[PDB]
Symmetry: C4
Subunit: 206 residues, 4 copies
């Protein structure tokens, strides 16, 4: 674990996240668990201007290194890490389809077998609270108790995994599931779903 | 403030606007406040052929330099500048989702907290008037009185900010909000929204 | 008018058409009026393998040069040229949104002022007939009598103008109008439209 | 037929499949009939890291070469080859629009004349069974009896042809048909379709 290799990967994740079309508009933030705190993207610097030197470190007490301002949404990354001790990377964005489903304040049900990737038969939707607020942190910490990803009402998506690319994958996969959901929901409501049992089998094979 | 640095930035904005997919089809126009008038993109020259020498200057009386024809939609950029004395850059386009919402002649309500970026709890929709017409100018001037962005009925979007990239961001952000609106509107009407008060809090934190 | 400059432009149009996302899937065909016949893209050669030598010439009697097979849809390009003597370039594709509207067998009404670009207050939809059939030719010739573009039922789009880039623009603009149509149609039917008179004014300013 | 030329083409297909936007999210798998077995993409290696050496060979008894793990979905490629003895390439993905239609568990009817490309007047939808399961193999083998492509319920798409690019084309064409279907279905249900007879004519001209 070297501070700079981790910093390079974070910028690469931010770039790749723009490449898949998850980033752009409000823009997300990425972080990796590090030492006692975490390394997180800074607030207000477009991925283009980013460099290893812009990545900020927040320790265990929420104290960030002097002269650097972490993401304005840094509080819930810590809630992510505290809630899922197995997570080493948190990716947060305001991707279009995820955000739209959270505007309807709905969980995404087992419409496709890959939903097992988040750890169960659903992608939850955490209740609304002002961004960067402590109450929002509880909402998300509670949602990630049993799921690796959650939607944030009238907000976006937050997904975590053991490393950055698996976290990016998950986040990207949740956009896909969100889009399949919106698309079929506009034709039939409720949308057909796989039973909990089939999901159990898939979870088994995963 | 150097005429040519500003001209280069305008072409870059036009290029970037095509990159985000806002431009193309009818095509937009960009301008920056300058001296007593403004520097605006010329009518009928695809971003590709553009150069610093094509950027036209219109003074305070609406007089443009000889041999150059400004954008056919130059009149409402002036209405933008006159209405918002704090705006130094106006970006206008006919982006797909913004235009679709203006076809329904609806304002975009507080469906996501970022709507506070336009200065309030909504993105208005100005009434229709022929393009390049003076009546259209009033409609837009009235809409931008209290908002940094407005939709134009059966037309498109017009957004302004203190500089070009913030204006481009806003314009891009309004497309996102427009798309979240259409998507959820096709499933439920009315779409859930944040109360004016929550918006007030966000405006506070912004 | 040099056979090879025209051939290079056609391949460029085919490439650009793929770039805007109009081409791909079934794939389109482009042609330019030439001498007594026309120069048209050949059947079954992906834009990538294309070269000036693949562009085929069909004379006035429908006879093509030996050893080269023109587009399987060459018959209606001739109907385009015969119907609109002012057209020097025909672009045909099976773009997604245009094709979807033609599946509903609906004309696109005056939902946006740019519809005047096709020459009136609507984009018609020609009746169905097997592709490469002579009856299909009449359907399209009749539709282009008074419009520069037309949709083909359960088929796609065909647009013409005085040169290739204006034809490409139009075709691209019709996809935009098609998409605005589908999007608002899924929320309200009928979709609000500009009166014939407003269109008349726009036609005047165009 | 050289093992390595085939391996290079498979990686190129995987890359191109990402380029059209079919791949990404769950990710697909490609294979080519080879000797007594087939050459298939390996499980868990992003197209970027892929190389000729990662392509795995499974013989006729389902035995794969030591030290290499084939795609977790290799069983139904064999069902593809056994069902369609004329197929030499199978492309499988979880493309967005195909998957959404299979979530509704609907076949795609003759909404556009190109549907004849799959061999008839429809694109079927095979019933659900756990991935990599033998029962899923029967479902797909039965569906491909008379069609070159089939959708897999709550899963994705599987298309085959005589070679890789024709298989890629078909797969891409099915996404298009899937999208035209969803789009018009959200406005009218049932969506207008061409009669079996018209399809017969097209099949004739194909
Ligand atoms: Cl549970
Ligand atoms: Cl107000
Ligand atoms: Cl008329
Ligand atoms: Cl049959
Ligand atoms: Zn956020
Ligand atoms: Zn305009
Ligand atoms: Zn065609
Ligand atoms: Zn699969």
């Amino acid at each position: 674990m070297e501070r700079n290799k981790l910093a390079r990967q974070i910028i690469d994740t931010c770039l790749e996240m723009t490449r898949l079309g998850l980033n752009q508009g409000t823009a997300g933030n990425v972080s990796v668990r590090y030492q006692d705190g975490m390394l997180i993207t800074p607030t207000g610097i477009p991925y283009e201007k980013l460099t290893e030197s812009h990545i900020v470190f927040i320790d265990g007490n929420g104290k960030h290194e002097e002269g650097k301002l972490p993401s304005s949404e840094w509080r819930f990354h810590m809630a992510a890490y505290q809630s899922r001790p197995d997570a080493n990377a948190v990716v947060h964005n305001h991707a279009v389809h995820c955000t739209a489903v959270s505007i309807l304040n709905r969980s995404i049900p087992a419409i496709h077998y890959m939903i097992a990737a988040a750890g169960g038969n659903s992608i939850p939707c955490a209740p609304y609270a002002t961004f960067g607020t402590r109450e929002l942190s509880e909402h998300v910490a509670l949602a990630l108790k049993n799921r690796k990803a959650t939607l944030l009402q009238h907000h976006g998506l937050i997904a975590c995994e053991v490393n950055l690319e698996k976290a990016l994958w998950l986040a990207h996969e949740v956009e896909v599931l969100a889009q399949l959901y919106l698309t079929t929901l506009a034709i039939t409501d409720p949308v057909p779903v796989l039973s909990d049992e089939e999901i159990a089998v898939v979870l088994e094979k995963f």
